[PDB]
Amino acid sequence: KKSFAKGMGVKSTLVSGSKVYMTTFAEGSDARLEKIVEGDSIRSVNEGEAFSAEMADKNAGYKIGNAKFSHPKGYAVVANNPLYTGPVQQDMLGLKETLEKRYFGESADGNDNICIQVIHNILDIEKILAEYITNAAYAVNNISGLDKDIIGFGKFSTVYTYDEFKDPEHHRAAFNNNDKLINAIKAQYDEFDNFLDNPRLGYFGQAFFSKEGRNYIINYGNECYDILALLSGLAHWVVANSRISRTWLYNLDKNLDNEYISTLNYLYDRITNELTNSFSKNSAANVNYIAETLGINPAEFAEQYFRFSIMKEQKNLGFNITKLREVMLDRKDMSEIRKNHKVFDSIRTKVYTMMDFVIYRYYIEEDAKVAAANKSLPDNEKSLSEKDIFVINLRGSFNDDQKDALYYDEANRIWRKLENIMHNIKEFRGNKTREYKKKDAPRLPRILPAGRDVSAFSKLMYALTMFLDGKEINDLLTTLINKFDNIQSFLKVMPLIGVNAKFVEEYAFFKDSAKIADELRLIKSFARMGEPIADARRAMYIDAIRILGTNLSYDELKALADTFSLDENGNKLKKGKHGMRNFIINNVISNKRFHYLIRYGDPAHLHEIAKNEAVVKFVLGRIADIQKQNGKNQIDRYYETCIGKDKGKSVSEKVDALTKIITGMNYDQFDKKRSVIEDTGRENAEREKFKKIISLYLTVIYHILKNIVNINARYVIGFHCVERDAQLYKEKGYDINLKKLEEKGFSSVTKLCAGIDETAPDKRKDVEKEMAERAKESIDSLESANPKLYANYIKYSDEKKAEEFTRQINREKAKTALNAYLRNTKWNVIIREDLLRIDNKTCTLFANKAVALEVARYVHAYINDIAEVNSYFQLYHYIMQRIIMNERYEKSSGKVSEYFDAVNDEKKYNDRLLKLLCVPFGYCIPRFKNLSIEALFDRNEAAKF
RNA sequence: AACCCCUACCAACUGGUCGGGGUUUGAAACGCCAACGAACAUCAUGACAGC
Ligand SMILES: [Mg+2]
């Protein structure tokens, strides 16, 4: 539920000294000051008003009103007064002053609530970076080999140049002449060579291979070492409490040698130069057809089409073109684009791109014309553009059934001026595509930036993207862009409201947060372009024919794989005789989801996962239960393509048939039909059936693995947070011990913030006595404190007074807490009781396994032992608890041993055990509850609960 | 919905009704950008060839 104040235009309410400054939305992420509050007086800075604000009753808030967007039910909207309670409000954990000191020196004084917000944005950036670097490192370690951990702590520490790493004897001054450390470097170089001739290194085609002609060539050893060292340096920086500190990422021009800068520049220039040098020959058809449709010379919009297609400037625009396009497609005049499959399944994307460009050009041209006209009129009477009016209406939409009506109405409004253009676009056919490629697109000056201009941080993010997949890249880069935009907006706002805080030198990198956002937008556009597989070798063929299912030994598999690209004599097959090789390459090896599965698992075990029936039915039912195209349509589409044409079957029967197809899967059904497969034609239905079956099978396994990886990422974030907060509380001046944080079950922070210590069998004599004496004082001093409650306390019965004395001790114990979360007596009586019954060695196991991603490596081992698969949260914690039981079951004692027995009996997870394992998160109640209760875990699954 | 704050009525006040607020709570401020989410909507018609 969006708050009504944001719809009415109120964006922020800041405190500086004894004054309150309110701020409204201006453009994109920018902010404009609106009101200044002094005591009981409210002044408006600007001539116009984005919102009217007046003082409310008891000076407890400001009533907000807008002429256009009023509250639907007529209730009053009040924004809170930060000075009503007292001084500036504090952080929930009470770490405001420490963080402000760390990030701003003595230039911050504490009479404001603006610096803490940029600090929290930086903290969010670090959070998501720590989430994704772990997955990248695990992928690289998985691909490298077995027991060959090449990336982590203590390896490739980005301090040593490649020359010092290959011949340490000739460069022993850089190692401080230490024989033990020198012998460690040589052993690392041996692992480097063995990793560099791995046949399966080609899965990272972008990172290590470059395309020269029609075939890929491995980069020089310098570049590969530099990339690996950069990734290991990121891994070191994540766990920084050495030469890699917390400030390593923000000072990269003084910590990195010229080699690393050269490698990053090489990669960036490589991606930019191909896009620049291939635009004219690749954008000819679309540009020529659009020119014919509109009726203008291509030179009049070539650059604008460049910015639309390659740089993707239609996304930083204030709204979504795609929704308008879909509303346009919903009409009866243009419905055949969806119904007529046989004519449009090969030109759908071209038509969509053309329509989007037409809409975007319409808006851009209208805005430019209005802006040009608004140059001779007086600075008072000026008209807005259609972009501005649409964004103004969108911002004040209190819900979603109002936002969609706006899209519907404006699509219908702007359809009247583009009917002919769309009707001409709909008349496009693939056959006449080579006709529009005869004349090439106009040449352009360089628009994309070079490697030198971009910062090292952005280039390092682009390098990191080469170890991930599309969804993760999108999430990471979008979050980073949002956080940097917030930081830059706050930094521009701060001068106006009288705050003269400046970043300390080590964190001066954030003084230029606006350029980083633009660079990251370009990188988000770039990261999804390029071939990710390099070449195809025999190892990839074996992996492909091992995920479908075989019961063959290794030598037989090698012979079968050699059959792909060799004859019965020993020479290579002639051109055009590769028909089974191309099928496998195009249908398995070249699938993005297969790349995901290889990057996060073992091919032979994913087949074991796929032989299960319950998980397959669960995934297919999840597909079938998608509302708003529909999930029921997709189930029918699979059945019609994979099984055939039939009528009278319900959803359950189709799901059962598809499950039977998926569960029984083997490579022999293709080796026997090899003759049919090598018959390439348009009437070979069996070939298409095979393709559809393979695609669906891969999709199912991909979903199953992806959800597990996401949940593990959540728990990694949680433990990163507990480590960071332990460091901060130590720096504040408390009595935490960081060296013993691991032998204790990561629960020292929870003990520290709970308050008084009673678990000690030495001082229970005083704590129980001290609480008793302060409890008795509060009862006597009640009429003075709370007279209204005292008038009812006397009327209590004698027995009821006794209960209130027991509760008063819990209240007194809660007054000694060190958080704002744990000062509530409700949560303190809960967290304390959990502290007594934990097992320290079990909690350390949960933390270690989550970081290493060992849940994803043992799904197949315990998938057949589960009783039911109702959700991924329920499946995740069965595998996690079965792993812990393997190592610690004989030595377990207490309630944990009782809990372990329950898992073996009922064959599901234990709710009570999860709460004990989540005790490290107890000092932060929202994270403690979200990570321990299924109902609050997933935001998208809330209708079910 | 969970966590925190506030006006008015009642309440051991470790709790509730009518409603508002929170970028300084939790993967989580607004418009975007994205995700759950499925043949999937591209720098390049499709199929074939090329590894
Ligand atoms: Mg936040």
Short mmCIF file of C-alpha atoms in Angstrom, two decimals, chain A residues 479-666:
data_model
loop_
_atom_site.label_atom_id
_atom_site.label_comp_id
_atom_site.label_asym_id
_atom_site.label_seq_id
_atom_site.Cartn_x
_atom_site.Cartn_y
_atom_site.Cartn_z
CA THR A 479 19.92 -2.02 -7.10
CA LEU A 480 23.30 -0.33 -7.56
CA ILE A 481 21.82 2.31 -9.89
CA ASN A 482 18.99 3.09 -7.47
CA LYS A 483 21.32 3.44 -4.49
CA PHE A 484 23.77 5.71 -6.32
CA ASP A 485 20.91 7.93 -7.53
CA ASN A 486 19.64 8.24 -3.96
CA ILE A 487 23.12 9.18 -2.72
CA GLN A 488 23.62 11.87 -5.36
CA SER A 489 20.18 13.37 -4.68
CA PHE A 490 20.91 13.57 -0.95
CA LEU A 491 24.35 15.09 -1.57
CA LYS A 492 22.84 17.85 -3.70
CA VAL A 493 20.12 18.47 -1.09
CA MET A 494 22.53 18.75 1.85
CA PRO A 495 24.11 22.18 1.01
CA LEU A 496 20.71 23.90 0.91
CA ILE A 497 19.49 22.87 4.37
CA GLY A 498 22.66 24.07 6.06
CA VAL A 499 24.58 20.80 6.52
CA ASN A 500 28.27 21.22 5.66
CA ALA A 501 29.33 17.59 6.10
CA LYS A 502 31.93 16.26 3.67
CA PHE A 503 33.20 12.75 3.00
CA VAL A 504 36.50 11.74 4.54
CA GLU A 505 39.33 11.09 2.09
CA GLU A 506 39.11 7.28 2.16
CA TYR A 507 35.43 7.56 1.17
CA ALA A 508 35.72 10.45 -1.30
CA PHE A 509 34.70 7.99 -4.05
CA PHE A 510 31.04 8.80 -3.33
CA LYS A 511 31.49 12.47 -4.28
CA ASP A 512 30.88 11.43 -7.92
CA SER A 513 27.90 9.11 -7.52
CA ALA A 514 26.02 10.57 -10.51
CA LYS A 515 28.48 9.43 -13.19
CA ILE A 516 28.64 5.92 -11.71
CA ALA A 517 24.90 5.51 -12.26
CA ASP A 518 25.15 6.40 -15.96
CA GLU A 519 28.12 4.09 -16.46
CA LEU A 520 26.19 1.29 -14.78
CA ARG A 521 23.22 1.94 -17.07
CA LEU A 522 25.47 1.47 -20.09
CA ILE A 523 26.96 -1.65 -18.51
CA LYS A 524 23.48 -3.07 -17.88
CA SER A 525 22.74 -2.55 -21.56
CA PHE A 526 26.07 -4.15 -22.54
CA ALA A 527 26.26 -7.18 -20.24
CA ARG A 528 23.63 -9.26 -22.07
CA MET A 529 25.33 -8.97 -25.49
CA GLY A 530 27.87 -11.59 -26.54
CA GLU A 531 28.33 -15.33 -26.94
CA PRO A 532 28.86 -17.01 -23.52
CA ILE A 533 30.09 -20.47 -24.63
CA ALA A 534 33.30 -19.94 -26.69
CA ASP A 535 33.91 -23.20 -28.63
CA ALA A 536 32.48 -26.69 -28.22
CA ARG A 537 34.71 -29.58 -27.15
CA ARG A 538 34.24 -33.23 -26.22
CA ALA A 539 33.81 -32.48 -22.51
CA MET A 540 30.77 -30.34 -23.31
CA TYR A 541 29.33 -33.12 -25.48
CA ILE A 542 29.77 -35.59 -22.61
CA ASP A 543 28.12 -33.15 -20.20
CA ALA A 544 25.19 -32.70 -22.59
CA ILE A 545 24.69 -36.45 -23.09
CA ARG A 546 25.11 -36.99 -19.33
CA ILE A 547 22.36 -34.60 -18.20
CA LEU A 548 19.80 -36.36 -20.41
CA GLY A 549 20.64 -39.69 -18.77
CA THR A 550 23.03 -42.54 -19.56
CA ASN A 551 24.31 -45.60 -17.71
CA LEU A 552 27.63 -45.79 -19.57
CA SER A 553 31.22 -45.76 -18.36
CA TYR A 554 33.73 -43.05 -19.24
CA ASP A 555 35.52 -44.82 -22.11
CA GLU A 556 32.23 -45.70 -23.81
CA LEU A 557 31.10 -42.09 -23.40
CA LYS A 558 34.33 -40.87 -25.01
CA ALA A 559 33.79 -43.24 -27.94
CA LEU A 560 30.19 -42.05 -28.35
CA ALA A 561 31.29 -38.40 -28.24
CA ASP A 562 33.99 -39.08 -30.84
CA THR A 563 31.25 -40.58 -33.02
CA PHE A 564 29.82 -37.04 -33.29
CA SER A 565 32.80 -35.57 -35.16
CA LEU A 566 34.61 -38.62 -36.58
CA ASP A 567 33.86 -41.33 -39.12
CA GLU A 568 34.46 -45.09 -39.00
CA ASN A 569 38.01 -44.55 -40.33
CA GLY A 570 39.53 -41.74 -38.28
CA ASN A 571 39.30 -38.55 -40.33
CA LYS A 572 36.90 -35.66 -39.80
CA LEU A 573 33.38 -35.82 -41.17
CA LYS A 574 32.84 -33.78 -44.32
CA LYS A 575 30.94 -30.50 -44.38
CA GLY A 576 27.20 -30.96 -43.95
CA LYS A 577 27.57 -34.41 -42.39
CA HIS A 578 27.50 -32.99 -38.84
CA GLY A 579 23.84 -33.51 -37.99
CA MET A 580 23.84 -35.03 -34.51
CA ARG A 581 26.56 -32.65 -33.32
CA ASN A 582 24.59 -29.57 -34.39
CA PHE A 583 21.40 -30.87 -32.76
CA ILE A 584 23.12 -31.28 -29.38
CA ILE A 585 24.99 -27.97 -29.66
CA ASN A 586 21.89 -25.96 -30.57
CA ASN A 587 19.45 -27.65 -28.19
CA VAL A 588 21.46 -28.38 -25.03
CA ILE A 589 24.88 -26.72 -25.02
CA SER A 590 23.62 -23.37 -26.34
CA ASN A 591 20.71 -23.10 -23.88
CA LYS A 592 21.14 -20.43 -21.20
CA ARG A 593 19.50 -22.60 -18.54
CA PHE A 594 21.94 -25.43 -19.29
CA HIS A 595 24.74 -22.92 -18.74
CA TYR A 596 23.18 -22.06 -15.37
CA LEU A 597 22.95 -25.74 -14.41
CA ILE A 598 26.57 -26.41 -15.39
CA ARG A 599 27.65 -23.31 -13.50
CA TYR A 600 25.89 -24.37 -10.28
CA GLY A 601 25.90 -28.16 -10.29
CA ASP A 602 26.92 -31.57 -11.61
CA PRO A 603 25.23 -32.92 -14.78
CA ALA A 604 24.89 -36.49 -13.50
CA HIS A 605 23.04 -35.43 -10.34
CA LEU A 606 20.52 -33.11 -12.01
CA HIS A 607 19.20 -36.18 -13.85
CA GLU A 608 18.81 -37.85 -10.45
CA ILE A 609 16.81 -34.82 -9.32
CA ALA A 610 14.71 -35.03 -12.49
CA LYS A 611 13.82 -38.71 -11.98
CA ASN A 612 11.71 -37.64 -8.99
CA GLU A 613 7.97 -37.28 -9.55
CA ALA A 614 6.78 -35.14 -6.64
CA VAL A 615 9.10 -32.21 -7.38
CA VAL A 616 8.27 -32.38 -11.10
CA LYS A 617 4.54 -32.27 -10.38
CA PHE A 618 5.11 -29.40 -7.95
CA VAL A 619 6.99 -27.34 -10.56
CA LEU A 620 4.40 -28.04 -13.26
CA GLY A 621 1.57 -27.10 -10.91
CA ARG A 622 3.35 -23.85 -10.09
CA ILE A 623 3.52 -23.17 -13.83
CA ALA A 624 -0.18 -24.01 -14.19
CA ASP A 625 -1.23 -21.70 -11.32
CA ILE A 626 0.06 -18.44 -12.84
CA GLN A 627 -2.69 -15.81 -13.04
CA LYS A 628 -2.42 -12.85 -15.43
CA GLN A 629 -0.45 -15.15 -20.72
CA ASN A 630 -2.10 -17.52 -18.26
CA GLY A 631 -0.56 -20.65 -16.81
CA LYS A 632 -3.35 -22.88 -18.10
CA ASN A 633 -2.53 -21.78 -21.64
CA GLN A 634 1.13 -22.75 -21.18
CA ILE A 635 0.23 -26.23 -19.91
CA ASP A 636 -1.89 -26.81 -23.02
CA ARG A 637 0.93 -25.49 -25.23
CA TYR A 638 3.40 -28.01 -23.76
CA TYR A 639 0.91 -30.85 -24.17
CA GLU A 640 0.07 -29.90 -27.75
CA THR A 641 3.75 -29.64 -28.72
CA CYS A 642 5.26 -32.45 -26.62
CA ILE A 643 2.49 -35.08 -26.58
CA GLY A 644 0.25 -34.25 -29.54
CA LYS A 645 -3.32 -33.20 -30.28
CA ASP A 646 -6.03 -34.50 -27.95
CA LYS A 647 -9.23 -33.22 -26.40
CA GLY A 648 -11.25 -33.78 -23.26
CA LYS A 649 -8.38 -33.84 -20.75
CA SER A 650 -8.23 -31.69 -17.64
CA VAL A 651 -5.16 -29.92 -16.26
CA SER A 652 -4.27 -32.79 -13.92
CA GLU A 653 -4.15 -35.39 -16.70
CA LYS A 654 -1.95 -33.20 -18.91
CA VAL A 655 0.35 -32.54 -15.95
CA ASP A 656 0.55 -36.28 -15.24
CA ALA A 657 1.41 -37.08 -18.87
CA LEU A 658 4.11 -34.40 -18.95
CA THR A 659 5.48 -35.73 -15.65
CA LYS A 660 5.69 -39.23 -17.12
CA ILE A 661 7.54 -37.81 -20.13
CA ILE A 662 10.02 -35.88 -17.95
CA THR A 663 10.68 -38.59 -15.36
CA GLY A 664 11.54 -41.17 -17.99
CA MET A 665 14.33 -39.41 -19.86
CA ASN A 666 17.31 -40.95 -21.62
#
